[PDB]
Design an enzyme around this catalytic site. Structure first.
Site, mmCIF file in Angstrom:
data_model
loop_
_atom_site.group_PDB
_atom_site.id
_atom_site.type_symbol
_atom_site.label_atom_id
_atom_site.label_comp_id
_atom_site.label_asym_id
_atom_site.label_seq_id
_atom_site.Cartn_x
_atom_site.Cartn_y
_atom_site.Cartn_z
ATOM 1 N N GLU A 198 0.783 -1.379 0.190
ATOM 2 C CA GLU A 198 -0.104 -0.091 -0.195
ATOM 3 C C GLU A 198 0.825 1.254 0.057
ATOM 4 O O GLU A 198 0.671 2.258 -0.842
ATOM 5 C CB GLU A 198 -0.779 0.113 1.273
ATOM 6 C CG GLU A 198 -2.163 -0.895 1.173
ATOM 7 C CD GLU A 198 -3.206 -0.787 0.345
ATOM 8 O OE1 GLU A 198 -3.231 0.203 -0.509
ATOM 9 O OE2 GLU A 198 -4.207 -1.569 0.163
ATOM 10 N N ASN A 243 -7.273 10.082 -5.882
ATOM 11 C CA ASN A 243 -8.146 9.224 -6.808
ATOM 12 C C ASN A 243 -9.106 10.484 -7.540
ATOM 13 O O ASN A 243 -10.069 10.758 -7.383
ATOM 14 C CB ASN A 243 -9.067 8.299 -6.312
ATOM 15 C CG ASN A 243 -8.313 7.172 -5.185
ATOM 16 O OD1 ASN A 243 -7.570 6.773 -5.809
ATOM 17 N ND2 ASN A 243 -8.412 7.347 -3.981
ATOM 18 N N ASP A 302 -13.044 9.917 -8.471
ATOM 19 C CA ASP A 302 -14.030 9.597 -7.620
ATOM 20 C C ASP A 302 -13.749 10.911 -6.457
ATOM 21 O O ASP A 302 -14.578 11.067 -5.649
ATOM 22 C CB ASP A 302 -14.607 8.596 -6.770
ATOM 23 C CG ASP A 302 -13.183 7.907 -5.933
ATOM 24 O OD1 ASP A 302 -12.357 8.707 -5.799
ATOM 25 O OD2 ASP A 302 -13.588 7.159 -5.398
ATOM 26 N N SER A 345 -11.508 11.245 -4.015
ATOM 27 C CA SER A 345 -11.183 10.715 -2.685
ATOM 28 C C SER A 345 -9.633 10.546 -2.699
ATOM 29 O O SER A 345 -9.112 10.756 -3.769
ATOM 30 C CB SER A 345 -11.874 9.487 -2.215
ATOM 31 O OG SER A 345 -11.273 8.507 -3.062
ATOM 32 N N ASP A 349 -6.513 8.207 -0.468
ATOM 33 C CA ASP A 349 -6.040 7.399 0.270
ATOM 34 C C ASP A 349 -4.957 7.869 1.401
ATOM 35 O O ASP A 349 -3.721 8.335 0.657
ATOM 36 C CB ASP A 349 -5.453 6.129 -0.564
ATOM 37 C CG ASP A 349 -6.443 5.691 -1.385
ATOM 38 O OD1 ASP A 349 -7.559 5.343 -1.104
ATOM 39 O OD2 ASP A 349 -5.934 5.334 -2.778
ATOM 40 N N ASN A 372 -9.115 5.098 2.700
ATOM 41 C CA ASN A 372 -9.659 6.077 1.906
ATOM 42 C C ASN A 372 -10.777 7.032 2.503
ATOM 43 O O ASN A 372 -11.401 6.710 3.527
ATOM 44 C CB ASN A 372 -10.379 5.322 0.940
ATOM 45 C CG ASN A 372 -11.182 5.975 -0.007
ATOM 46 O OD1 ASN A 372 -12.360 6.408 -0.067
ATOM 47 N ND2 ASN A 372 -10.489 6.488 -1.016
#
Length: 130
Positions: free
Chosen positions: A35, A46, A49, A51, A53, A60
Site C-alpha cells: 500500500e 483518486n 471519485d 477521494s 488514500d 480512503n
C-alpha cells in the site's frame, strides 16, 4: 516516517494486530508494504471519485476518515484523515481494525488481493522476532 520492516512488525505486534479477526501479522505486513512501502506520509488522490488514500495502510477518505473535501464521506473511523499521516501509527491501526471488521475483511483492500492473497507472505515477518 518510513518504517524499517522488523521495526514495523514489532510495532504492529504491540498494537494487538497479530491474529486480529484471524489476520496474521505477515498479512498486515504484506498489506502495508504494497500500500505504502511502510511510509506513513503516503497519500494518493483518486481523480475519478474525488477521494484520497492516507498513510501506511492507504485508508480512503470516502468511508473511513474525514478530510472535509470528499463527497459522500462517511467517517466510519471517526477520525480526521490528518490522524493517518502521523509518525505514530496508533490511530491508523485503530482505524484499520474497524475496516476489517466489515464482512469483507482484509479482502476489501485490492492491493492485498493482487500481491498477498494465496501467496507465501511469511517472508515479511521472518527475522523480526515476532
Amino acid at each position: 516516517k518510513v518504517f524499517e520492516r522488523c521495526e514495523l512488525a514489532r510495532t504492529l505486534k504491540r498494537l494487538g494486530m497479530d491474529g486480529y479477526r484471524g489476520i496474521s501479522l505477515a498479512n498486515w505486513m504484506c498489506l502495508a508494504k504494497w500500500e505504502s512501502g511502510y511510509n506513513t506520509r503516503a497519500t494518493n488522490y483518486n481523480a475519478g471519485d474525488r477521494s484520497t488514500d492516507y498513510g501506511i495502510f492507504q485508508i480512503n477518505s470516502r468511508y473511513w476518515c474525514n478530510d472535509g473535501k470528499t463527497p459522500g464521506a462517511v467517517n466510519a473511523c471517526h477520525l480526521s484523515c490528518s490522524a493517518l499521516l502521523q509518525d505514530n501509527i496508533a490511530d491508523a491501526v485503530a482505524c484499520a481494525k474497524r475496516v476489517v471488521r466489515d464482512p469483507q475483511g482484509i479482502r476489501a483492500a485490492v492491493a492485498w488481493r493482487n500481491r498477498c492473497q494465496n501467496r507465501d507472505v511469511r517472508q515479511y515477518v521472518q527475522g523480526c522476532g515476532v
